[PDB]
Amino acid sequence: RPPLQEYVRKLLYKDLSKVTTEKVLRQMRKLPWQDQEVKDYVICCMINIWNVKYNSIHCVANLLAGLVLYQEDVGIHVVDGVLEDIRLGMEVNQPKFNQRRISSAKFLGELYNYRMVESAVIFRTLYSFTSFGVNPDGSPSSLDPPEHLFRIRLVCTILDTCGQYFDRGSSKRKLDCFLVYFQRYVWWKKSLEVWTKDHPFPIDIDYMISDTLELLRPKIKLCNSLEESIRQVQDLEREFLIKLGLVN
Amino acid sequence: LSKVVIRRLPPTLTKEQLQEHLQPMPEHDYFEFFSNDTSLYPHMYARAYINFKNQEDIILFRDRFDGYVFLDNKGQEYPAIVEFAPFQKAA
């Protein structure tokens, strides 16, 4: 394995922690960024964020924020790459990649926290989890078959990472709107014929959703039925219709 | 929104070969090719970003190339996907 590859790998996956961030930054800066193979390798190593311990993922976002002062193109390519990986992960959707896909979602959330992406990128991604390859009547599909509940884990992962910053102003409204759509998505999954008395919907997924939502919105109404969740969506879409002027 | 991605291209397609398929190319600021950078091996695909100058040219471009079938050496089909990039910042 070539020397610069082992060097980059060592800096990002071994040396980098909360206490060495300034030293790793200094070293990354002096890399031969004019060598295209080396620049490509660093980008590729950062997109492959699963190699990094979960609790040090945020250190890679922080390192990238220092680095884009001198090498801005690198940061753009990493963000573009992580978002491509989140999309490809839904197309592939094999359980052996679960840990890697979660690491990518957490990394995107930390990229928002260290100001590498704006909130629009986060909301685009959250809606993609509830709509991409999802039939609009809530029937199962190729990418979202019945016992696949991983979209719910992905959503909760992003919300747990950066959701606390969407509590004032316009981002507050945007999160409130997304949660109305999320609660319907959850009731579509819960309403599938596979779930019975003998084969119940997993209680652990239920608790994941309620813990996430109650942390962000202590007074939120958790819907107790599919009907209630559809009505919330209908009331919200009546508001939209008024704003868009399709009728009035 | 001016930054457009064309993705799920064959993993051994090159920027130049892609250009031969796309021409005549509309006016653009930026046009770069990416591949071999996923965390989900062996699911390998290639892709590109283009930043268009006018808005009407974007609608034309995806009418033409969304679903356009590229081939690799062995004759496997690769329908491309054309959408706005999820991150709009240009390099």
Side-chain angles (χ1 to χ4, degrees):
Chain A
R1 183 108 86 181
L4 261 350
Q5 286 176 204
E6 299 282 47
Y7 186 41
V8 167
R9 281 185 123 264
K10 187 188 130 129
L11 293 165
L12 294 177
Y13 302 157
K14 284 158 235 171
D15 303 350
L16 179 56
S17 74
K18 190 80 218 181
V19 85
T20 65
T21 35
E22 322 261 294
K23 177 167 168 178
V24 173
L25 175 52
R26 203 229 337 127
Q27 289 174 103
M28 298 281 303
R29 282 190 54 193
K30 65 55 179 247
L31 287 165
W33 296 106
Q34 327 79 49
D35 190 326
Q36 188 65 42
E37 289 189 315
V38 173
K39 182 183 262 172
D40 284 343
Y41 198 73
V42 173
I43 287 162
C44 183
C45 283
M46 281 183 189
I47 293 161
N48 280 268
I49 192 69
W50 65 275
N51 290 291
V52 175
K53 274 174 57 160
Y54 199 76
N55 67 115
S56 296
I57 293 179
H58 71 71
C59 312
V60 182
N62 193 33
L63 163 63
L64 207 50
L67 188 58
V68 294
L69 272 298
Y70 315 93
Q71 237 53 57
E72 197 197 47
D73 63 327
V74 177
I76 294 158
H77 299 328
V78 170
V79 166
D80 280 341
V82 172
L83 294 163
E84 167 65 23
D85 238 25
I86 293 170
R87 176 53 57 84
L88 186 60
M90 291 189 281
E91 296 163 345
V92 170
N93 198 26
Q94 293 187 221
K96 65 194 189 176
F97 297 124
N98 275 189
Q99 285 175 78
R100 298 192 196 177
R101 290 173 63 201
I102 291 304
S103 289
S104 291
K106 163 94 169 151
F107 188 34
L108 182 68
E110 294 296 346
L111 287 173
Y112 171 84
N113 292 342
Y114 289 86
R115 308 168 142 177
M116 295 295 316
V117 301
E118 282 174 278
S119 72
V121 173
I122 300 300
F123 284 113
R124 204 167 276 136
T125 300
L126 286 167
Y127 280 109
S128 85
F129 293 152
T130 59
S131 82
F132 176 66
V134 174
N135 291 331
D137 70 346
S139 63
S141 59
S142 168
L143 301 190
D144 197 6
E147 303 203 81
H148 166 251
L149 298 167
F150 197 69
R151 297 305 180 79
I152 295 163
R153 288 185 61 190
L154 286 162
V155 163
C156 284
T157 295
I158 293 197
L159 295 185
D160 281 349
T161 298
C162 67
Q164 270 169 48
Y165 305 109
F166 305 147
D167 70 335
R168 307 220 177 178
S170 72
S171 66
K172 184 204 183 327
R173 164 173 181 286
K174 294 199 236 161
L175 178 59
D176 285 352
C177 289
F178 170 75
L179 292 179
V180 165
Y181 284 105
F182 185 53
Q183 293 212 67
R184 180 180 69 177
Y185 173 82
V186 169
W187 277 101
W188 281 346
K189 297 302 298 195
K190 284 178 179 202
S191 300
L192 298 166
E193 67 176 338
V194 67
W195 315 117
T196 63
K197 295 196 186 132
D198 287 312
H199 190 106
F201 191 86
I203 198 81
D204 291 328
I205 293 299
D206 263 337
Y207 287 143
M208 179 180 295
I209 295 153
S210 66
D211 290 351
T212 292
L213 263 56
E214 288 174 355
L215 171 51
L216 300 167
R217 295 290 187 273
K219 302 190 186 113
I220 196 164
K221 179 77 188 125
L222 302 180
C223 304
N224 281 125
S225 83
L226 170 61
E227 312 84 68
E228 189 190 341
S229 81
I230 288 169
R231 281 174 184 173
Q232 276 200 347
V233 164
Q234 292 173 333
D235 295 345
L236 175 53
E237 287 182 350
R238 194 176 311 109
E239 290 167 32
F240 294 166
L241 187 50
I242 289 157
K243 277 151 181 209
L244 298 166
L246 309 197
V247 163
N248 303 285
Chain B
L1 304 165
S2 53
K3 183 177 164 170
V4 174
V5 67
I6 165 148
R7 58 180 301 274
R8 294 182 62 84
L9 304 163
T12 59
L13 197 65
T14 69
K15 184 182 169 191
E16 282 72 46
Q17 275 152 11
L18 210 211
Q19 202 161 218
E20 291 195 300
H21 289 297
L22 292 180
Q23 76 204 145
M25 296 234 30
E27 293 157 48
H28 62 285
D29 277 37
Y30 178 95
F31 170 48
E32 293 271 320
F33 196 80
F34 302 94
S35 70
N36 298 324
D37 60 344
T38 180
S39 77
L40 302 179
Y41 178 93
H43 303 84
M44 306 302 117
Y45 293 94
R47 73 189 185 280
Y49 304 89
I50 303 172
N51 195 243
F52 288 68
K53 277 247 259 97
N54 328 280
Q55 275 220 130
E56 75 228 273
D57 284 305
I58 300 174
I59 295 149
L60 288 205
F61 185 79
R62 82 89 213 278
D63 282 355
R64 209 180 158 196
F65 296 107
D66 189 57
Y68 181 100
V69 193
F70 291 89
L71 315 168
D72 68 359
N73 190 280
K74 308 244 156 170
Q76 308 147 231
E77 285 179 27
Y78 282 80
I81 287 176
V82 176
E83 284 168 9
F84 285 106
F87 187 47
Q88 284 289 310
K89 206 158 185 213

